[PDB]
């Protein structure tokens, strides 16, 4: 009697805000949403293709009505009864323009100002090709405190080639089915890759049908999945109106089901980049240290090519690693740019490209900084540590120039060593290690329950390290004897 | 200098309409004037153009319907950060 998808986002131990929908026209008289969704008078859509358009047969409301119902329907919705305002940016044939979408986003910004400051969620169940201006408009809205949620796209492709999917500050949602596997749609299916933040139910989703005011229908697509996460965001903000986007994103990530997806469905080179997360409501209206992993784009084959991974503005970058499938890399470093710490990975002169991999955390009232030492030519290698009192080591980085090679970093003698140090109230971190004589393909070590992985690293002196990265609270080192080094923290 | 951008997916391209994005901190009256400047320049070259919208509040700039012939001209306007060709978005 409970739709599988509503059960699926509901955790074991299971509680003001406005949701804007930019989509097709909606049927606001439908029993699922009546009196709770308002149709704004905004609409900016292209003409239908008249050679295939028969107005009398067409159901112009079908897509938007169903999505409003998934978000806030009284019987089948995620945030039942939630308040919604709809804007029409898609015509009867499901088509809109980047320009119309911009004008719709501007309209929302306009409303936010003259209306009583409160949390707002914007659901964008649509996609086009990568657009610089559309991504920029979304970023600008996100920095004004708006939570934007969008579909990853239905093309079984890398979501970073689409917008607004590829906008970093937007929450991008892929679709999974009742078996928690990626949805197939025709011969295609949910998009994937590093621009997808998480997945949510997106197959066989029951919801309001505009056929009639009490009618229901089942639909599939990443639109439906994004609608689930918009509902979840709405329930979270309804209980904690003060929650910021950064905090909300970290919580969505933290409370999702981990590792329920078989990654074999994704192309091989996307498996490491794609989060294995299926959305769920936090079992809680509501302290702990949240961190997430952020992969950069591939650097490219150039000998001097670099990749950059950045954190959200409210976040601190606590560590920085790098990965190359070929293994040919020159390490990584944490640099300052615009008074913000970024993670820069450097490519080897014979390499095809590297990823930079940042670890981004919410650490209130933290003052972090980087400390570097140049190469040494010593038996103890190159070393740096956090001198200042109350400053804790949260991560180590190392980059070198040549090709062939408590609270302290140790790197190769030929390499520069970089240490991330933070001062924050009650911050304590410790190191955990694990080595294996015969590296079968990867060495890992995880932080104990209650601790958060902030740094992930391999011990220097090895020739067969492809790189290292955090997966949730596990540190993963990739080899072609090797030791994985985790830095784990918490706030007492 | 000012760059031009278009959708990588050729069939989703909508040539003939462009978002002209101006450098940030550009004020509304400046975007308004830059749009009218483009129109006057294009008119002297025998081109009809239409300003469809002038943005303020999210991004500074304007939406213009015009021939792609004029892109080089538009890229030389004062305050221009970059210009993007309109393109389609689709229900998912």
């Amino acid at each position, epitope marked *: 009697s409970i739709p599988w998808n509503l059960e699926r986002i509901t955790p074991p131990r299971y509680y003001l805000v406005e949701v804007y929908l930019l989509d097709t026209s909606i049927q606001s008289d439908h029993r699922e949403i009546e009196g709770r969704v308002m149709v704004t008078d905004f609409e900016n859509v292209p003409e239908e*293709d008249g050679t*295939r358009f*028969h107005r009398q*047969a*067409s159901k112009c409301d079908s897509h938007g009505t169903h999505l409003a119902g998934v978000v806030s329907g009284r019987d089948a919705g995620v945030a039942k009864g939630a308040s919604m305002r709809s804007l029409r940016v898609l015509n009867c044939q499901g088509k809109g323009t980047v320009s119309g979408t911009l004008i719709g986003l501007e309209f929302i910004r306009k409303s936010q100002l003259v209306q009583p400051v409160g949390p707002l969620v914007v659901l964008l169940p649509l996609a086009g090709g990568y657009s610089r201006v559309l991504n920029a408009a979304c970023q600008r809205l996100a920095r004004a405190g708006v939570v934007l949620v969008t579909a990853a796209g239905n093309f079984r492709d890398d979501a970073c080639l689409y917008s607004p999917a590829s906008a970093p500050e937007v929450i991008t949602v892929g679709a999974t089915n009742a078996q928690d596997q990626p949805v197939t749609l025709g011969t295609l299916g949910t998009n994937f890759g590093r621009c997808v933040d998480l997945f949510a139910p997106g*197959e066989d989703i029951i919801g309001a049908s505009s056929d009639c005011s009490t009618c229901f*229908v089942s639909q599939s697509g990443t639109s439906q999945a994004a609608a689930h996460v918009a509902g979840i965001a709405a329930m979270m903000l309804s209980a904690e109106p003060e929650l910021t986007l950064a905090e909300l994103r970290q919580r969505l990530i933290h409370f999702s089901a981990k590792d329920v997806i078989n990654e074999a469905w994704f192309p091989e080179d996307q498996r490491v980049l794609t989060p294995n997360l299926v959305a769920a409501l936090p079992p809680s209206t509501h302290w702990q240290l949240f961190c997430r992993t952020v992969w950069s784009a591939h650097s490219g084959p150039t000998r001097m090519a670099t990749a950059i991974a950045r954190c959200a503005p409210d976040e601190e970058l606590l560590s920085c690693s790098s990965f190359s499938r070929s293994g040919k890399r020159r390490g990584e470093r944490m640099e300052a740019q615009g008074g913000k710490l970024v993670c820069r990975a450097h490519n080897a002169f014979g390499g095809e490209g590297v990823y930079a991999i940042a670890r981004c955390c919410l650490l209130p009232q933290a003052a972090c900084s980087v400390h570097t030492a140049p190469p040494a030519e010593a038996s103890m290698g190159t070393r740096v540590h956090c001198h200042q009192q109350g400053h804790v080591l949260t991560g180590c980085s190392s980059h070198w120039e040549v090709e062939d090679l408590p609270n302290q970093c140790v790197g190769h003698r030929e390499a520069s060593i970089h240490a991330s140090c933070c001062h924050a109230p009650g911050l304590e971190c410790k190191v955990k290690e694990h080595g294996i004589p015969a590296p079968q393909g990867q060495v890992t070590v995880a932080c104990e329950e209650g601790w958060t992985l902030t740094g992930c690293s391999a011990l220097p002196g090895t020739s067969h390290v492809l790189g290292a990265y955090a997966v949730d609270n596990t540190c993963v080192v990739r080899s072609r004897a090797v030791t994985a080094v985790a830095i784990c923290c918490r706030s007492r | 200098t000012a760059t031009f951008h278009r959708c990588a997916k050729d069939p989703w391209r909508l040539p003939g309409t462009y978002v002209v994005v101006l450098k940030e901190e550009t004020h509304l009256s400046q975007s308004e004037r830059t749009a009218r400047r483009l129109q006057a320049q294009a008119a002297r070259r025998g081109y009809l153009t239409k300003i469809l919208h002038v943005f303020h509040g999210l991004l500074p700039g304007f939406l213009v319907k015009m021939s792609g012939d004029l892109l080089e001209l538009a890229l030389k306007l004062p305050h221009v950060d970059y210009i993007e060709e309109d393109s389609s978005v689709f229900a998912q």
Partner: antibody
Framework: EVQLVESGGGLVKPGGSLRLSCAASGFTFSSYSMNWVRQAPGKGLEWVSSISSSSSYISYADSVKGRFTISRDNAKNSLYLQMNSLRAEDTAVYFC????????????????WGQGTMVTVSS | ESVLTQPPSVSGAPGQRVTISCTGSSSNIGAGYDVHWYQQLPGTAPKLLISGNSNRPSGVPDRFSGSKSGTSASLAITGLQAEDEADYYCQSYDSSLSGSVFGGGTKLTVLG
């Protein structure tokens, strides 16, 4: 499993009418476009008509334009083809086939077909 | 009389490699629409063989491959097997017709 079963075929005289149905099961019908494709005995496949998931795209081959009318009923998981003013040349097996509705963003393959229903038009 | 042109027939012995071409125009294949291929065994419904120019559905052996170039596309079958005897159809959307039309079909015969 995913399944399509068309019915309604028969023998009819020139100038007459038939109504084909196609029942879908095993999948989310309301997110798929549907199509009729026909094949005269010993001949090639011929696209007849297409209708999108919300019926906002509808089109017809020239050869049936004005005589055939496609429609669908998502609540009943059904696709219809109303055939009027039938001619001998309309004699063929008629298949239905689905393709996921990408709203013209992409035109996917017809990835599942029915087994077809036979239609003969003869004096 | 079909918008897409295929050779009427092709043949090979078990083990050989054969190809089937599909040529269209600027209103379909040359307009950026993908070609999809179908196999129809004698007395059955068509089934999907290659989608999106070159993708194989689950259950289709890697002996089958497809490619597209310009206004034409090609289906290739290596290690020809007896059960490959069938008719093969290409398909592509055509923007002037507003429909996804089919080639005239190629009859493949397994010899030897």
């Amino acid at each position: 499993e995913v399944q399509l079963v068309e019915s309604g075929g028969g023998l009819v005289k020139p100038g007459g009418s038939l109504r084909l149905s196609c029942a879908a099961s095993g999948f989310t019908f309301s997110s798929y476009s549907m199509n009729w494709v026909r094949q005269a005995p010993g001949k090639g496949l011929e696209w007849v008509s297409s209708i999108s998931s919300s019926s906002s795209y509808i089109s017809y081959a020239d050869s049936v334009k004005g005589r055939f009318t496609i429609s669908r009923d998502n609540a009943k998981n059904s696709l219809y083809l109303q055939m009027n003013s039938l001619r001998a040349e309309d004699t063929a097996v008629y298949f239905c086939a689905r393709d996921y509705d990408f709203w013209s963003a992409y035109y996917d393959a017809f990835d599942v077909w029915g087994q077809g229903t036979m239609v003969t038009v003869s004096s | 009389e079909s918008v897409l042109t295929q050779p009427p027939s092709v043949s090979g012995a078990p083990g050989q490699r054969v190809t089937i071409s599909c040529t269209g125009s600027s209103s379909n294949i040359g307009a950026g629409y993908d070609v999809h291929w179908y196999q129809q065994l004698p007395g059955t419904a068509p089934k999907l063989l290659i989608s999106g120019n070159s993708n194989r559905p689950s259950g289709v052996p890697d002996r089958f491959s497809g490619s597209k170039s310009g206004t034409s596309a090609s289906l290739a079958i290596t290690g020809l097997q007896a059960e490959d005897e069938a008719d093969y159809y290409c398909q592509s959307y055509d923007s002037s017709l507003s429909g996804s039309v089919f080639g005239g079909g190629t009859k493949l015969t397994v010899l030897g």
